[PDB]
Design a protein around this ligand. Sequence first.
Ligand SMILES: [Mg+2]
Ligand SMILES: [Mg+2]
Ligand SMILES: [Mg+2]
Ligand SMILES: [Mg+2]
Ligand SMILES: [Mg+2]
Length: 148
Amino acid sequence: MQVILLDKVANLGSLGDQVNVKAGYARNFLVPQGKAVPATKKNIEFFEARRAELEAKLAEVLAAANARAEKINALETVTIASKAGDEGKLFGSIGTRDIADAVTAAGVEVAKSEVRLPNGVLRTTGEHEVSFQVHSEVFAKVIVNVVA
RNA sequence: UGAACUCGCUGUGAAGAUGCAGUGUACCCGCGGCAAGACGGAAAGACCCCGUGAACCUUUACUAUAGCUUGACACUGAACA
Ligand SMILES: [Mg+2]
Ligand SMILES: [Mg+2]
Ligand SMILES: [Mg+2]
Ligand SMILES: [Mg+2]
Ligand SMILES: [Mg+2]
């Protein structure tokens, strides 16, 4: 499938680019996720007409919004006193839903799917390093303090 | 249930005769019995054979097929070795 882009995806295409990609990748991933649209002759003519002078600006303001969201909190200890057992060995395993609710209780607007983790379970108490995926380009590393 | 004025023997005869030949006996007709014969009645022999007949059934008969299994392509992607 010949497809014209709207986002800096990693390995296939640059911005404003019409690349030929596998049709499953074009159908299930790009056109739902809002990064690419099918290279109809009308579509590439319409993109050269108006949308190339807007989607770059939208990418710049999205990168700025990711910078704003990542630096409204970087203090790197969010306190959760969830339930635990004695001397390590957390009671019930922590969901990233709960980690999302903790940081949106004190700070950022980051939801569940905007959060990555090495483990994802955080099944003991201590300084567990948490990553973040508010965008595929930029990360953020704000750390958690879980206690009983 | 072809029609009957439907005896016995010996012989002849699709080769085991109430019906032919030869011969012996028997007046016409019931009734109650028996059941040897009328190749008695019943049922186009059920065993056998024939049909370039049928059915089911078996299998290492033939040719197929549902199924189960194999691989290619599609639905079907991204990375990294
Ligand atoms: Mg005789
Ligand atoms: Mg008699
Ligand atoms: Mg009697
Ligand atoms: Mg008879
Ligand atoms: Mg017959």
